[PDB]
Write an enzyme that holds these catalytic residues in place. Sequence first.
Site, short mmCIF file in Angstrom:
data_model
loop_
_atom_site.label_atom_id
_atom_site.label_comp_id
_atom_site.label_asym_id
_atom_site.label_seq_id
_atom_site.Cartn_x
_atom_site.Cartn_y
_atom_site.Cartn_z
N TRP A 215 -2.51 11.62 -6.71
CA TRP A 215 -2.51 11.65 -5.29
C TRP A 215 -1.32 11.02 -4.54
CZ3 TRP A 215 -3.57 8.10 -0.87
CH2 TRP A 215 -3.54 6.83 -1.23
N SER B 149 -5.23 12.58 12.14
CA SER B 149 -5.70 11.45 12.44
C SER B 149 -4.77 10.62 13.30
CB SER B 149 -5.29 10.63 10.90
OG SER B 149 -6.78 10.82 10.29
N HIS C 127 -0.40 1.33 1.36
CA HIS C 127 -1.26 0.19 1.37
C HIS C 127 -1.94 0.01 2.98
CE1 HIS C 127 -3.16 -3.40 0.49
NE2 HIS C 127 -3.25 -3.71 1.59
N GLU D 67 -3.09 2.39 4.56
CA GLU D 67 -4.25 3.33 4.52
C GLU D 67 -5.57 2.55 3.59
OE1 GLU D 67 -6.38 6.67 4.11
OE2 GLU D 67 -5.10 6.06 5.47
N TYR E 8 -6.28 -0.29 3.84
CA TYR E 8 -7.11 -1.13 4.96
C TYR E 8 -7.78 -0.20 6.00
CZ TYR E 8 -5.01 -4.71 2.18
OH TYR E 8 -5.05 -5.65 1.05
N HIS F 128 2.63 -1.98 -5.09
CA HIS F 128 2.25 -0.75 -5.89
C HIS F 128 3.58 -0.40 -6.74
CE1 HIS F 128 -1.38 -0.14 -3.93
NE2 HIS F 128 -0.67 -0.69 -3.14
N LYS G 279 -14.00 -13.35 6.71
CA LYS G 279 -15.00 -12.40 7.07
C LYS G 279 -16.21 -12.35 6.22
CE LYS G 279 -13.97 -8.59 9.10
NZ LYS G 279 -14.43 -8.94 10.34
N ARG H 132 -4.24 4.50 -17.16
CA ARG H 132 -4.94 5.75 -16.20
C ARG H 132 -4.36 7.04 -16.15
NH1 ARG H 132 -3.58 3.59 -9.95
NH2 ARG H 132 -4.43 5.62 -9.55
C1 HEA Z 1 -10.94 -0.43 0.38
C2 HEA Z 1 -9.87 -0.14 -0.09
C3 HEA Z 1 -8.75 -1.27 -0.90
C4 HEA Z 1 -8.69 -2.52 -0.31
C5 HEA Z 1 -9.45 -3.23 0.91
C6 HEA Z 1 -8.05 -3.32 -1.31
C7 HEA Z 1 -7.82 -4.82 -1.11
C8 HEA Z 1 -6.68 -5.40 -1.86
N1 HEA Z 1 -6.10 -4.89 -3.22
FE1 HEA Z 1 -5.99 -3.05 -3.72
N2 HEA Z 1 -6.00 -1.06 -4.23
C9 HEA Z 1 -6.74 0.16 -3.57
C10 HEA Z 1 -7.46 -0.13 -2.49
C11 HEA Z 1 -8.18 -1.28 -1.93
N3 HEA Z 1 -7.46 -2.36 -2.27
C12 HEA Z 1 -6.38 1.25 -4.16
C13 HEA Z 1 -6.78 2.74 -3.88
C14 HEA Z 1 -5.49 1.01 -4.83
C15 HEA Z 1 -4.60 1.97 -6.08
C16 HEA Z 1 -3.80 3.02 -5.61
C17 HEA Z 1 -3.33 4.07 -6.78
O1 HEA Z 1 -2.47 3.43 -7.55
O2 HEA Z 1 -3.93 4.92 -6.60
C18 HEA Z 1 -5.29 -0.39 -5.13
C19 HEA Z 1 -4.13 -1.09 -5.68
C20 HEA Z 1 -3.74 -2.50 -5.81
C21 HEA Z 1 -2.75 -3.11 -6.14
C22 HEA Z 1 -1.62 -2.31 -7.42
C23 HEA Z 1 -2.02 -2.49 -8.69
C24 HEA Z 1 -1.05 -1.45 -9.41
O3 HEA Z 1 -1.19 -0.30 -9.33
O4 HEA Z 1 -0.58 -2.03 -10.56
C25 HEA Z 1 -2.66 -4.34 -5.76
C26 HEA Z 1 -1.46 -5.26 -6.28
O5 HEA Z 1 -1.46 -6.53 -5.63
C27 HEA Z 1 -3.70 -4.53 -5.14
C28 HEA Z 1 -4.34 -5.87 -4.31
C29 HEA Z 1 -5.25 -5.86 -3.63
C30 HEA Z 1 -5.68 -7.25 -2.84
C31 HEA Z 1 -4.98 -8.63 -3.01
C32 HEA Z 1 -6.65 -6.99 -1.79
C33 HEA Z 1 -7.12 -7.83 -0.79
O6 HEA Z 1 -7.05 -7.19 0.51
C34 HEA Z 1 -8.41 -8.19 -1.31
C35 HEA Z 1 -9.01 -9.39 -0.46
C36 HEA Z 1 -10.30 -9.68 -0.76
C37 HEA Z 1 -11.02 -10.95 -1.64
C38 HEA Z 1 -10.05 -11.98 -2.16
C39 HEA Z 1 -12.44 -11.00 -1.54
C40 HEA Z 1 -13.11 -11.85 -0.45
C41 HEA Z 1 -12.37 -13.16 -0.12
C42 HEA Z 1 -13.09 -14.39 -0.50
C43 HEA Z 1 -14.58 -14.61 -0.97
C44 HEA Z 1 -12.23 -15.86 -0.21
C45 HEA Z 1 -11.98 -16.65 -1.47
C46 HEA Z 1 -10.94 -15.81 -2.41
C47 HEA Z 1 -9.81 -16.15 -2.97
C48 HEA Z 1 -9.36 -17.71 -2.47
C49 HEA Z 1 -9.14 -15.47 -3.97
N4 HEA Z 1 -4.53 -3.49 -4.82
CU LIG Z 2 -1.58 -1.95 -1.67
#
Ligand code: HEA
Ligand SMILES: [Cu+2]
Lengths: 43, 94, 227, 58, 84, 79, 46, 259, 514
Positions: I126, I157, I240, I242, I244, I291, I319, I438
């Site tokens: 994608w 959108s 990214h 997207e 959120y 990414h 939150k 993957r």
């Molecule tokens: C709903 C969608 C969504 C959300 C909200 C998030 C949230 C986050 N994502 Fe994720 N992410 C994806 C969807 C999402 N991601 C998708 C689709 C991909 C892949 C795309 C692809 O390659 O196809 C991806 C890929 C992705 C990568 C790339 C990995 C790679 O391809 O090698 C990374 C790297 O940093 C990352 C990090 C995070 C982090 C740090 C958050 C943070 O926002 C999370 C924060 C939440 C918490 C930490 C939990 C609650 C917190 C607490 C309870 C507090 C105490 C916690 C601490 C002190 C740690 N994400």
């Molecule tokens: Cu990201």
Amino acid sequence: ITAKPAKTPTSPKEQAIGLSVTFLSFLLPAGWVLYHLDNYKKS
Amino acid sequence: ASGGGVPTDEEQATGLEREVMLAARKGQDPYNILAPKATSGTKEDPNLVPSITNKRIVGCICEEDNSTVIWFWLHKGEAQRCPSCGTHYKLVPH
Amino acid sequence: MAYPMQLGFQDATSPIMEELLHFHDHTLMIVFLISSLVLYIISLMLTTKLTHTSTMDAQEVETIWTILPAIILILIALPSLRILYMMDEINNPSLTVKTMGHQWYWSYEYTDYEDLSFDSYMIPTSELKPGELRLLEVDNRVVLPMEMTIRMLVSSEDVLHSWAVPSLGLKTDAIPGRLNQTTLMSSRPGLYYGQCSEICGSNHSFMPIVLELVPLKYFEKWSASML
Amino acid sequence: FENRVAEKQKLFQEDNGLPVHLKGGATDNILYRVTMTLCLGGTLYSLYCLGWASFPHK
Amino acid sequence: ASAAKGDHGGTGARTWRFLTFGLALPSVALCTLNSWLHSGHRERPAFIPYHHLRIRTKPFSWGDGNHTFFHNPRVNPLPTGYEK
Amino acid sequence: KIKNYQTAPFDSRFPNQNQTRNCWQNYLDFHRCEKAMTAKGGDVSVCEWYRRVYKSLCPISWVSTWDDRRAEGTFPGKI
Amino acid sequence: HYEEGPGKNIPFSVENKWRLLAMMTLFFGSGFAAPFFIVRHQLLKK
Amino acid sequence: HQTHAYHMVNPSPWPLTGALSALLMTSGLTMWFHFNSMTLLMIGLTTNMLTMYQWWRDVIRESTFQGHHTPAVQKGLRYGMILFIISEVLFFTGFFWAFYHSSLAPTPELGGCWPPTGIHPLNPLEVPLLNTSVLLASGVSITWAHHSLMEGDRKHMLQALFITITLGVYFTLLQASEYYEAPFTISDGVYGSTFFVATGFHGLHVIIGSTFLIVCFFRQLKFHFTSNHHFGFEAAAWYWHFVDVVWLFLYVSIYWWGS
Amino acid sequence: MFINRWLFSTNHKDIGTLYLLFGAWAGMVGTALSLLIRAELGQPGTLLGDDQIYNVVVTAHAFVMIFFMVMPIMIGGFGNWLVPLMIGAPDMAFPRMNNMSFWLLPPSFLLLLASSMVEAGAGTGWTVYPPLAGNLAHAGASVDLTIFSLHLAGVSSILGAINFITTIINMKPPAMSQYQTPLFVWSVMITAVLLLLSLPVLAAGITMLLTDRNLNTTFFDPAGGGDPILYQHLFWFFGHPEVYILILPGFGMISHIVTYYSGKKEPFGYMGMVWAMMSIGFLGFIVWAHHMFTVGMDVDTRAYFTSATMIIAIPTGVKVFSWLATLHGGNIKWSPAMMWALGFIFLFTVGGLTGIVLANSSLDIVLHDTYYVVAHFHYVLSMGAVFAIMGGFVHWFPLFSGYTLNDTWAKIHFAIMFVGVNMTFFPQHFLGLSGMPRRYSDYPDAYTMWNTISSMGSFISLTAVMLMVFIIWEAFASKREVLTVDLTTTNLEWLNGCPPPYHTFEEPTYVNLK
Ligand code: HEA
Ligand SMILES: [Cu+2]
Ligand SMILES: CCCCCCCCCCCCCCCCCC(=O)OCC(COC(=O)CCCCCCCCCCCCCCCCC)OC(=O)CCCCCCCCCCCCCCCCC
Ligand SMILES: CCCCC/C=C\C/C=C\C/C=C\C/C=C\CCCC(=O)O[C@H](COC(=O)CCCCCCCCCCCCCCCCC)COP(=O)(O)OCCN
Ligand SMILES: CCCCCC/C=C\CCCCCCCCCC(=O)O[C@H](COC(=O)CCCCCCCCCCCCCCC)COP(=O)(O)OC[C@@H](O)CO
Ligand SMILES: CCCCCC/C=C\CCCCCCCCCC(=O)O[C@H](COC(=O)CCCCCCCCCCCCCCC)COP(=O)(O)OC[C@@H](O)CO
Ligand SMILES: CCCCCCCCCCO[C@@H]1O[C@H](CO)[C@@H](O[C@H]2O[C@H](CO)[C@@H](O)[C@H](O)[C@H]2O)[C@H](O)[C@H]1O
Ligand SMILES: C[C@H](CCC(=O)O)[C@H]1CC[C@H]2[C@@H]3[C@H](O)C[C@@H]4C[C@H](O)CC[C@]4(C)[C@H]3C[C@H](O)[C@]12C
Ligand SMILES: C[C@H](CCC(=O)O)[C@H]1CC[C@H]2[C@@H]3[C@H](O)C[C@@H]4C[C@H](O)CC[C@]4(C)[C@H]3C[C@H](O)[C@]12C
Ligand code: CUA
Ligand SMILES: [Mg+2]
Ligand code: NA
Ligand code: NA
Ligand SMILES: [Zn+2]
């Protein structure tokens, strides 16, 4: 939440019908394609 | 030339735009553009809530800066009170 | 290579991979703790008939739950960044090897002295010798000297690929027009396996990487035997 | 030119039940039918082209 | 940061017309002169079939597939050079 | 004849993961030098360092394509 | 003006639950079946 | 009825015909690029123009002729146009990013320099400078039009807006001529790519903006605007200043710094 | 009248209903694609015997779930139904433009279908990275139809974002400040600002891909001086934000659901929840290169992106703890919506934490492009978005329809789903840690056990989806009409009854200032 009694109550028998019909509508077409995969891969 | 020839709103506004303009001239707010200012809200001095009909939804911000608004239908008749802070509201039809 | 029912990382073959294992153990402990605390507190909130439904003041408790996560993040980031900067520091290699990705195989070039190059293809399942590994073997392995710092240069002659060897902690994207560098150091002789790690079409799943680590004198004999 | 806005205000406020995109009179209907015919016909044509393009053409 | 001009007191149409005719359109007139002095054709350069130029990975969807949309024969060579 | 050359050393001009320009620069350096050394009094042996570095670092197909383009008159770098 | 109220603010009828069941089955079943038939189509193409 | 000031819009077919026009244009481009045919594309362009014409006609009917644009409704339209312009700025930002990415780190295929070997840029002091003076001047003239309208002066509003449109047309014809004279093309590597796609999308916005100003010109001829209520003119002016500012960024970045 | 009402709509509720219908149908398509994926991997070897087709299935699965299931349901469906009701507005600001945001999506989806039917499909991921997605490795129309599909979804959108921002800023009661509007309305506003700013950059990027494929540009082609990595930057600068965008309306619905079934008049720490959403939205624009940790970037850039990425855990944790503090002291109603929300809090937390693992660029070298990433986002995105959507659907179905669900059936459906998604995705952590890439149609034999279990899990969630359809049928079949709901004093969307009249708030609410 509160609600009036069902206008058209759905008996357990009626539910079993709707559920079976629902499940069959997902399963049969996909089943047909997957069953015949080898008939496709050889064409 | 520095002349004229551009209509004014007074000359050419129509429909709802013109009604709002005319009501504003008379200091009236039939289309609810302004926020009403509260009375003291006592039983003797209730907030007066206009309506074109016999009930209207009130939202009560009970204290300044509350983020939670308290919502309820206010009906024609005896004043009602906010279920959170008790301030009084009285419907005044139309 | 991975083995059946494996839960964690492949055993480390290089010092940097050992560092990552220890760093992962550290971070996973924190992940487990926070996940488990959240689950516990959910159950704690849900298991009492006592109530308090009037407005609650939030300021005091929000200091705790910003300061403590901030401290935890710092305790992750400090070892994280230390390892990052270790990987990057000058390592002065004794050998450079290039690899070029293709659809769908790798080629390798050893051009420090002699102009050696060759292609490296997956062994089809139908041709595997008995006891060899499905989807992982190649016809020509990347012979390399153990216990030595090697510069790998990675590129591609067509689409994106990615050259990876998990037990050495290595993954470097293979991009046409670009020469990416990574460093390789095996603590041990042996065979070390990896797989193309950027989708590159039809046969992405089928262009593996196999390193063959041997003592220097054997590496030199092998080099020597190629002219 | 002279200011004829009042006459258009009278036209577009006439209580004839017409939605605004038809309230100008018979020309609106013509333009609407042209537009809709082109859109729906083109959409049918685009589906035909999908069908054609979905299979190898020898 | 306001040029060397200097005329307010209650901005208005008269001032912006003054700017339009007294500064803006004179500037256009002067750049138009400048431009229609430095007009006239330059020596076109020797053709060299550089591989980063005259790119053709797919034929264009018009003409013979090998001419750009606003192709100018006098100054745009094809991958094989200038046209006859 | 200072050698004992094993592979290309770290070059502070090119300290990051992208080594493309290091390959390119030594390829230019070698060929600029080899051209200069066809003046009166020149031998290509002075150019050897650049030659070893670019041969160590550059993909064979990059070298081959660049060589082809130098012969065609389409090489875009300045030599 | 339009009809209002339960079962009237939707583009499908719920007047008869078995007709409804057919409609919902065609609706969700068509979307679920489509990827299986596209896969079939690609496998059959050549 | 209602006792708020907002606009409940009559059910309309133009969202559907606009969405179908988008299907026809994109499938039409696909058929043009891959199956040697302009048919679908021509239908889609035609239905798109029909859709825009009838939709914005209806907005005029709703406001000038029916009175639905209260101050609250107008305020909403102001926000909507600002937000639309912001989205257009971000669209151009992607092309500027591509330009700086390519030009700040020229690859070996280019000669490792910018402009690339073999590229002979336009002189930015010739037609590009003239174009800059043209759009800057039209920002002055459209501001004169705005003040004339506010001051109730029909004749000078029409003169100033006419001058503004004339300059926009002059820019477009100058740019069309420069495209034809340019010795480099869109297929001339990343230099040609960034130059023609970025200035080409800008030129498209100049044509869009000029068309919007022409709509305003005819509406002004027909006395639609009052001295206080004329949001179509304000939106077209905002859009026009946006087109002028994008040009300044293009001029400094691609034509001048990139030469 | 049928065409006027459902094809020519200018009504926020009816357009919201169209979006929910569209999204549900898309959900069936995306589910079917996910089962084909897991069928291919459910035993070693090849099932489809055509890995290009496999890659096409993976690509389509993602686009369908993100662009045709989650965003239409959350923003188009819940947003259009709920936002005007929650602020007492009589419709959206641009009610007619709103209908075009809807009707652009069936053509967008048709273009995606066309992509997969012509030639050999777009088997690109994608992400659609060049040169794999270019005109030599993906010759023919499939990728261009995919690009056009994304253009139409993008216009949809962007215009919907313009509509929601304008509505929310401009159409509240005159006394209601932004700090008196409900958290779901905040969540939609912030989501809309992210869409407004991010989608044009995606549009720029895929347009450059279009012209590289068809007009002999070389933005991404080194032979012309272009760079494949530039495409990645443009894509992820959108991508990214997207992710959120995909979760933020979910956070908004979760706040309302947890508040409601805890018997509370308000969420804990309202201004903190607004702060946290705005902070997540802002930080969501400065982290995209996580990414790209294996593409060859300088070490200091990797250090910055690690650090910036981890900071997002701070507002997110506010939150999470605030939801817990909303439950605190509640009179807990164990409704099916509450179950979805509780499952959301826990599974979203697990997924966010593996995101923090991945943020560490050193460890991401070994985890990038492995099933660890797949496990991360199917927890935080797939389960996150799906559980918030299911919680919102069960909670608000009686408002939209006028009819109640069978709560016991809804709880059964929750239970099946909870088992199924965890059996499917939890073992994928092991597959990632142990090095399974993957985007693979088959795997070395060592990886068989967890792939087998994961595929078995996918069938359990299929049983849940089927059951969900039956449950919706049973509700419309039995016609239990709603009388009253509790807590209307703090849930304005219910106060016009179920379903609300076609026109609501014709007389606006009365809110004074005092
Ligand atoms: C709903 C969608 C969504 C959300 C909200 C998030 C949230 C986050 N994502 Fe994720 N992410 C994806 C969807 C999402 N991601 C998708 C689709 C991909 C892949 C795309 C692809 O390659 O196809 C991806 C890929 C992705 C990568 C790339 C990995 C790679 O391809 O090698 C990374 C790297 O940093 C990352 C990090 C995070 C982090 C740090 C958050 C943070 O926002 C999370 C924060 C939440 C918490 C930490 C939990 C609650 C917190 C607490 C309870 C507090 C105490 C916690 C601490 C002190 C740690 N994400
Ligand atoms: Cu990201
Ligand atoms: C609802 C059920 C559906 C059914 C499907 C499954 C659901 C998941 C429930 C499963 C219940 C989970 C309990 C903790 C799982 C850790 C397993 C493990 O041994 O992990 C090992 C490590 C790597 O470790 C190693 O390098 C060495 C491995 C061997 C250690 C030495 C002993 C040798 C024998 C080991 C025997 C087994 C040890 C296990 C020891 C067990 C300790 C608990 O792998 C990993 O990092 C994988 C971690 C992924 C990151 C996510 C962490 C957050 C989850 C916390 C709550 C659970 C949510 C579940 C998701 C939701 C669950 C409710
Ligand atoms: C006169 C001032 C400039 C006015 C504009 C001129 C025409 C542009 C029309 C639209 C511009 C938008 C797309 C830009 C695409 C490329 C066009 C670049 C501008 C241009 O016109 O470039 C010309 C090439 O056009 C070509 O390829 C052919 C171009 C025709 C086909 C375009 C197809 C692509 C359209 C894609 C649209 C995507 C839109 C997505 C929006 C999504 C929003 C979320 C340059 O001619 P040349 O002969 O190469 O060199 C001149 C040498 N003498
Ligand atoms: C050669 C032809 C090329 C064709 C391609 C596209 C073509 C041309 C499009 C040009 C845009 C024309 C827009 C005309 C809008 C007219 C309707 C209008 O202006 O409506 C005004 C409201 O504004 C409103 O909706 C504001 C409406 C905002 C319109 C914004 C338009 C920008 C369009 C961009 C579309 C392309 C995007 C870029 C592609 C990459 C009406 O309100 P007032 O003016 O206050 O009047 C009321 C007073 O009379 C009361 O006393
Ligand atoms: C590769 C080829 C891809 C092709 C994709 C083609 C996609 C779409 C086909 C588009 C057809 C457009 C038809 C005209 C649309 C006019 C919309 C408009 O003007 O909307 C206005 C609101 O948006 C406002 O103002 C401000 C916003 C004005 C928006 C004008 C239209 C822009 C459409 C393209 C946008 C692209 C985004 C650009 C950035 C990347 C009015 O809103 P209504 O609800 O109508 O009325 C409210 C009443 O009170 C008015 O009296
Ligand atoms: C990923 C989601 C997939 C879930 C799995 C679906 C579960 C099974 C559903 C049933 O599907 C049916 O299975 C039959 C086999 O039981 C097939 O009949 C086939 O096999 C029969 C027995 O050999 C013959 O009588 C039939 O004519 C022949 O079509 C039939 O086509 C198919 O509809
Ligand atoms: C000042 C502002 C609004 C207060 C109000 O007007 O109601 C509040 C709302 C949320 C608060 C923030 C959040 O509670 C999160 C952080 C909590 C720390 O205890 C202080 C900084 C911290 C970053 C807070 C600073 C400030 O008090 C904020 C930003
Ligand atoms: C006909 C109209 C008279 C104003 C009115 O009708 O009261 C006048 C006033 C201003 C005139 C316009 C403006 O002077 C600007 C233009 C002047 C050009 O020389 C001719 C066309 C041009 C566009 C004029 C056409 C026409 O004569 C206009 C439009
Ligand atoms: Cu080569 Cu994946
Ligand atoms: Mg990758
Ligand atoms: Na004005
Ligand atoms: Na398989
Ligand atoms: Zn009160």
